[PDB]
Every structure is written in C-alpha cells, then in structure tokens.
C-alpha cells in the first residue's frame, strides 16, 4: 500500500528480541479467512510470475513426507514413486509471534509468523523453492487427509539473523508478499 513501511517498524519492534535464536524462521503466508492456501488457478499464476521475473534467483524442488508425532515434526525423504524413504529431519516448531497483515479488498490475506524450529498425521509436500536474494518463495502442493491444497509463503534467507533481518528487510517482505497477495482471482 506504499506506506507498509509504517507497519514494518511495528513488526521489527515485536520480534527484535528473538533474532539471537539460531533457529528463527520468519515467514509471510498467503491465505484467506485463516487457512494458508490459495486456489490452484492463482497458484499457477504466482508460479508463472516468479519463474519469469527473477533472473538472478535460484530454484529447487523437493517432495517431502511430514508426520506430527508427540509435538515433533518428522521429515521423510521420498523415492520416485513418492513413498517415504528414511527420515531426514526431526524438528519441533515453536511459534513466538504471529499477526495477520491488512491487505486490499479482494486480495489474499497475509499471515506474518515468527517461529523457532529446533532440531532433535501425514503431509506429502511437493515444494518448489525460488530463492531471490534474502527471500525464498515456497510454493507447496500439500496433501493432508486426502485433500490437496496450494500453499504459498515467503521465507527469510539469512547468514546473520541479527545483522540482516532489519526493518528495511521487513518492508521488502511486505511489498513482495503484497505483490502476490493482489494476484487473487
Ligand atoms: Mn516455512
């Protein structure tokens, strides 16, 4: 909205004290009221926009198998057929701060969430990552309980959370998520 610089100062103040945690995850999720999911149409529109516009970005794809057991998220690798082949990550996600972001009418809703993922149901995640600088666009096709949903979120990529997550970086995260939020149809 061009004055989202104002709301980024409030975000920085609320999560400044958490930057020292080495396992900080900072995410902006797209959704609708809150279910962090977009339509398959808009999912393909967002994918086309990001595949075309960022020339200096990198991309990868990974097919995952997540299981929530005793509060710990067990991440499994997958074969060509898509069945779990060995566990690759044991993580527990603790949520530190979360607030939804005001978006224009008709746009997708935005959920800002600061989390911690400390190393230690069934979700098959077909995730496509496009990494432009300090921003990772995660387009996932999640099947949980026999339902396929399309998730889009922007993650923070940092070498130093303390040195690099600044108020300026939060402004750009809002501007980038809002560009995708206004792609709702
Ligand atoms: Mn994430």
Q: Taken in order 112, 114, 118, 121, is the CA torsion positive or negative?
A: negative
Contacts of 5 (CB under 8 A, 6+ apart): 171
Residue 114 CA to ligand 1 center (angstroms) comes to 10
The total number of residues shown for the chain amounts to 185
Tracing tokens 């566990």 back to the chain, one arrives at: 87
CA contacts within 13 A on the Cβ side of 107: 19
Q: How many other CB atoms are there within 10 angstroms of residue 140's CB atom?
A: 21
Query: Is the distance from CB of 180 to CB of 108 less than 8 angstroms?
Result: yes
Rg (CA), the chain: 16
Q: Is 3 annotated as a binding residue?
A: no
What's phi and psi for 53, nearest 5 deg?
A: -95, -30
Are 150 and 159 in contact by the 8 Å Cβ rule? The answer is no
Whether the CB-CB separation of 152 and 30 falls below 8 Å is answered with yes
State which H helix or E strand residue 110 sits in.
Answer: strand 109-119
25 appears as a binding residue in the annotation: yes
Tell me if 63 sits within 8 A of 82, measured CB to CB: yes
Where the chain is discontinuous (C–N > 2.5 Å), the residues before each break are 33, 120
* DSSP label at residue 108: P
Ligand 1 centroid distance, CA of 136 (Å): 9
2 alpha carbon – ligand 1 mean position (Å): 26
In angstroms, the CA 42 to CA 181 distance is 10
| 117 C-alpha to ligand 1 centroid (Å) | 9
For residues 53 and 159, give the distance between their C-alpha atoms in angstroms, rounded to a whole number.
Answer: 24
The percent of the chain in helix, strand and coil, each rounded to the nearest 5, is: 25, 50, 25
Label residue 7 exposed, middle or buried (CB < 10 Å: 0-12, 13-18, 19+): middle
- What are the tokens at 177? 């998520």
First-last CA distance in the chain: 19
Cα dihedral 23, 31, 182, 94 in deg (nearest 10): -10
């Amino acid at each position: 909205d061009a004055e989202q610089r104002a709301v980024a100062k409030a975000l920085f103040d609320a999560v400044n004290k958490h930057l020292s945690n080495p396992f900080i995850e900072v995410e902006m999720r797209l959704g609708q009221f809150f279910t962090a999911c977009v339509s398959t149409e808009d999912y393909e529109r967002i994918k086309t926009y990001l595949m075309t516009e960022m020339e200096n970005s990198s991309m990868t794809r990974s097919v995952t198998h997540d299981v929530s057991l005793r509060g710990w998220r067990h991440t499994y690798a997958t074969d060509e057929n898509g069945n779990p082949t060995r566990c690759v990550s044991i993580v527990r996600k603790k949520r530190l701060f979360v607030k939804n972001i005001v978006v224009p009418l008709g746009a997708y809703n935005l959920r800002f969430a600061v989390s911690t993922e400390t190393p230690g149901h069934t979700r098959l995640k077909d995730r496509l990552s496009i990494t432009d600088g300090m921003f990772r666009y995660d387009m996932t096709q999640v099947t949980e309980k026999g339902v396929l949903m399309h998730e889009v979120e922007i993650e923070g990529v940092f070498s130093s959370h303390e040195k690099q997550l600044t108020e300026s970086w939060l402004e750009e995260l809002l501007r980038r998520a809002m560009r995708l939020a206004t792609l709702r149809t």
